[PDB]
Amino acid sequence: AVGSVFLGGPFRQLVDPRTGVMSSGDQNVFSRLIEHFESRGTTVYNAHRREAWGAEFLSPAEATRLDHDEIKAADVFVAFPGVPASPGTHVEIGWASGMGKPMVLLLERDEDYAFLVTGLESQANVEILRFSGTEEIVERLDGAVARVLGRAGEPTVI
């Protein structure tokens, strides 16, 4: 039973400047994943919900500290690197892989991602989950999380 997960992905890039929040459509995948884990007893750390989807942003300094500390606390790191790339999420991918965390990276099917992201497969404790929709993520995530977590602490190149 997975104790806790950190869920990362594009955020500021998805906030509508006119309303100051993410659209319901853009929130959907995050809320679905949050509920998915929490209903199974897994605590979820996630900036989007923490900062009310854009309405209660923290400062650069406070966001940085919290994201880093919650990634360090969480048993598993799950994140969308983003199309286009989320720069903040890529920093977090660095933090998590540098900590030797079990990681599931959620990559859009047929989209291009960076070499230092796809190259982490078999260099770190990482599973890539390519997806074409939210239901597919929900159906496959538990198996992926379980596989990486099963190898937690085992030595990697990183």
Residue numbers in the entry: 12 to 169
Show the paper's wording.
5-Hydroxymethylcytosine is then released via hydrolysis of the N-glycosidic bond of hmCMP by MilB. To a less extent, MilB can also directly hydrolyze CMP to ribose 5′-phosphate and cytosine, which is further processed by downstream enzymes in the mildiomycin biosynthesis pathway and is incorporated into the dehydroxymethyl mildiomycin as a minor component of the fermentation products of S. remofaciens. Although MilB belongs to the nucleoside 2′-deoxyribosyltransferase (NDT) family, it catalyzes the hydrolysis of hmCMP and CMP rather than hmdCMP or dCMP. In this study, we determined the crystal structures of wild-type (WT) MilB by itself to a resolution of 1.8 Å and its catalytically inactive E103A point mutant in complex with its natural substrate hmCMP to a resolution of 2.4 Å.
In the crystal, there is one molecule of MilB per asymmetric unit. However, a dimer is related by the crystallographic two-fold symmetry. Our size exclusion chromatography result also confirmed the dimerization state of MilB in solution, which is consistent with the quaternary structures of both Rcl and purine deoxyribosyltransferase, two members belonging to NDT family. The final model at 1.8 Å resolution contains residues 12–169 of MilB for each protomer (the full-length protein consists of 170 residues), which possesses an α/β-fold with a five-stranded flavodoxin-like parallel β-sheet with a standard order of 21345. The β-sheet is flanked on both sides by α-helices in an asymmetric manner. In the structure of MilB alone, Arg23 exists in an extended conformation. In the crystal structure of MilB by itself, Arg23 adopts a relaxed and open conformation, with its side chain completely stretched out. Its guanidinium group points outward, facing away from the active site of the hmCMP-binding pocket. By comparing the structure of MilB by itself with that of MilB-E103A in complex with hmCMP, it is found that Arg23 in the substrate-unbound MilB faces outward from the active site pocket and is about 5 Å away from the supposed binding site of the hydroxymethyl group, forming an ‘open’ conformation. When the substrate hmCMP is not bound to MilB, the conformation of Arg23 exists in the ‘open’ state.
